[PDB]
């Protein structure tokens, strides 16, 4: 069983923790507890293989360089509710490319909180638009709350890492 070091990144409040905890624990985190740094472990099956995921859940408002050096795959999370969270993702992407010193980094753009369709500031099209600008990146709209596209985030990263 291969080990996969995954890192969830993005600005404060986007639902990095909510997504992770939903994926690993099948629980929806209601309260907002700003994260320092959490690590979770979960065995999954991606493409007929057992994988051990170690998932690092990072602080939004915050050792970043270290995470990027160590991580194999990066979930880049914004909230469709909050425009600045989307804006911030360009720098993270460019930092990761810098630190890893390569274009070819397993990576997914994740538009979270797709259950607050009402409060949606960021559009789905801008989402998908951003991802193509990023070397035909992967893109998902997700909800930690509704359990939509939660697992796919992580499986997609495994696949990419395996490529």
């Amino acid at each position: 069983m291969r080990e996969y070091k995954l890192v969830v990144l993005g600005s404060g409040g986007v639902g990095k923790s909510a997504l992770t905890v939903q994926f690993v624990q099948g629980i929806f985190v209601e309260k907002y507890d700003p994260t320092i740094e959490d690590s979770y472990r979960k065995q999954v099956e991606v493409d007929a293989q057992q994988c051990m995921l170690e998932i690092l859940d990072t602080a939004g408002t915050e050792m970043r360089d270290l995470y990027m050096k160590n991580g194999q795959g990066f979930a880049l999370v914004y909230s469709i509710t909050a425009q600045s969270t989307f804006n911030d993702l360009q720098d993270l992407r460019e930092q990761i490319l810098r630190v890893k010193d390569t274009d070819d980094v397993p990576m997914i753009l994740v538009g979270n909180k797709c259950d607050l369709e009402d409060e949606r500031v960021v559009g789905k099209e801008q989402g998908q638009n951003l991802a193509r600008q990023w070397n035909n990146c992967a893109f998902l709209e997700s909800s930690a709350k509704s359990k939509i596209n939660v697992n796919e985030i992580f499986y997609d990263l495994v696949r990419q890492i395996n490529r």
Partner: protein, 307 residues
Amino acid sequence: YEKVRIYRMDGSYRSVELKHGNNTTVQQIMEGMRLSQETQQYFTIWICSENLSLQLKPYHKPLQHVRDWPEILAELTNLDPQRETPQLFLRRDVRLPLEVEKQIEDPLAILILFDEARYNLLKGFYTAPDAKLITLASLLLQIVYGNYESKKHKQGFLNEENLKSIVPVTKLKSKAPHWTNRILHEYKNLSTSEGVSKEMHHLQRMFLQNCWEIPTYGAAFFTGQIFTNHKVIPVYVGVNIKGLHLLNMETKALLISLKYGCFMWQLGDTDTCFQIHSMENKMSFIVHTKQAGLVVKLLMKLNGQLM
């Protein structure tokens, strides 16, 4: 700020700000977690290195125990202080009554208790008949692999690789290979059973219910030695809410298991051994360990709790 990692048995952790540096208490650390009171009441902070695990109390300052670890090791054990750096873990409270644990509905509390239970099982700390061990294995298959599929699981699935994640390590070789058919059968039975909720916390709770009957469930383990033409046998001394249990240290074989009210203890004046008198028997034995005092304090406490 200063911060610390609080580990769990599965190797996960959560970072917690130390408001008061190395003066931060267990209490304040428990607060810094993302647990409610419907979670926090079941668990506390332990300090563990490879050969010594201690439950800390609310007023303890854990980082001071990390600091003082070489002196603690030297006081409580005979080990090599160079090999042990301790870490802090969130684990079940050894004082948690079984009756209270049966109350638990909270999914987070269930999975935390579950992860710890699973850890103990795979390490060989739970002694139970093969039937029970097989049930537990089938539940972990459901839990970890999901629904049984004839295609995927019927044959050449449970090699030693897969078996290792579902059976005690102490049985992986001698007994487990013979089990593989009956595990799959109960696994299949679980999957197709519509009377068995496949909700994670429900399946985890079932696993636990099976563990609740195992004599060593929720035991704190200390180390010491017994003497049997006098031969030294290193032992784990397991103290839980049910009583006291001796494991052969090497095989984790269950040597004796005594319920509270069926045995008496006496602390050596030296504080380095204790005697157990097994009433409804002519049985008595003496355990040598520098943990003798902790062991006896804990016996008294957990005996004291029964009503």
